[PDB]
């Protein structure tokens, strides 16, 4: 097998969904072409080429506009990669726990606290910051109860999984609306352990090419 | 103890996904209806079933729980995780709902469709967010209709690339299982399904399936008499 997928990521330094993929690519040492897209229509968007597109066979590339599907694609399309981000298939219970945590974040927090929805909330004369902070706080409470069951060094045991990959950019996004991370001690410990990772530092929202100077670290 | 217990509600779209998947795969389960309109998920009987109190809740029993080994059960409060769990925990089931592992591109396409519904539509148009919108003095029905119309436009674009008889090719996948209750939820808020011709056709093809009829929101033990059909 001589199959070598080519990856290009249309992303944004501050997008929490783009940050999942940045983290996942660095942890797995998978080279990608970064195409920054300044949001101030889908971001992120991962374009995979040099593959068999079994959906659109005459097409050179295959697009994935949803970060969770893009993450699972990385797990499935690269079976020889030295770092799986899921427990193995023979452990469906641990995989379900990992996916539960990803879904609380990807389904219960991110979609109700993004720019699009904050704007809809301001259109109803609400306070988008308060709306987002209360929803993030509630979602992190559910994350924390699941981490009480599974966390070791990381969200699920002592290895990094997709759960930690989702957790990190969601902490960045939650802190921006003033959520107090200290309310969720296992989440906080796992977050900090993840920031010790060089791959997480390379994926950092303050450390990308399109990070504005005011925001750089 | 049953292998599977679904605490569901007849008109919950996430519960609908699970009912459809169980019928499609002929997997026996025990149904406990929890009336979300009466706030029954806060009652004492459902106390010890944490999460906090989510509907649907899938309780899985008689298993080796490799996360909490002192227990022979676990519960899953996220329908997407629960759907994937059925695929992996029952690998020899007569109806797999994802294309095989040797076609990761088609599994990615299926997951993308599920994610649009499960991430971009259902969370912003569910009962919790509608109540929040109502408290702002907005119209929750209009809010949800706009958001579902927008999500369906993105689904329809993906179906243009993949759909045959069903969402992805000619076989039922998890994309179809997510689509059906999403169409039910969207129509409930006045979305015009005819604007999305591929979605409409796939939805009508799914409604030909007896399993979908057994999972139908109008055909559950807890469907009120005036909503039955």
Residue numbers in the entry:
A (entry chain B): 0 to 39, 55 to 231
B (entry chain A): 3 to 231
Provide excerpts from the study.
The 2.2 Å resolution apo structure contains two pseudosymmetrically related dimers in the asymmetric unit. The apo structure reveals a nonsymmetric homodimer with each protomer comprising two subdomains: a C-terminal helical domain and an N-terminal thioredoxin-like domain that is common to all GSTs. The C. immitis protein exhibits a nonsymmetrical dimer in which one protomer has several more ordered residues than the other; residues 39–52 are dis­ordered in the second protomer. These residues correspond to the cap of the active site and coordinate glutathione in the G-site (see below). All four chains in the asymmetric unit contain a sulfate molecule that binds to the backbone N atom and side-chain hydroxyl of Ser15 as well as the side chain of Gln124 and forms water-mediated interactions with several additional residues. A sulfate ion is observed in approximately the same orientation off Ser15 as in the H-site of the human ζ-class GST crystal structure and is believed to simulate the expected binding of the substrate dichloro­acetic acid. The equivalent Arg190 in the C. immitis structure resides in a different rotomer conformation without forming interactions with the sulfate ion (which is approximately 4.8 Å away in each protomer); it is involved in salt-bridge interactions within the crystal lattice.
Crystal structures are presented for a putative uncharacterized protein that shares sequence similarity with ζ-class glutathione S-transferases (GSTs) in both apo and glutathione-bound forms. Each protomer consists of an N-­terminal βαβαββα thioredoxin-like fold common to all GSTs as well as a C-­terminal α-helical domain. Based on sequence homology, structural similarity, half-site glutathione binding and sulfate ion H-site binding, the protein investigated here is likely to be a ζ-class GST/MAAI. Glutathione S-transferases (GSTs) are detoxifying enzymes that appear across a wide range of aerobic organisms, including bacteria, fungi, plants and mammals.
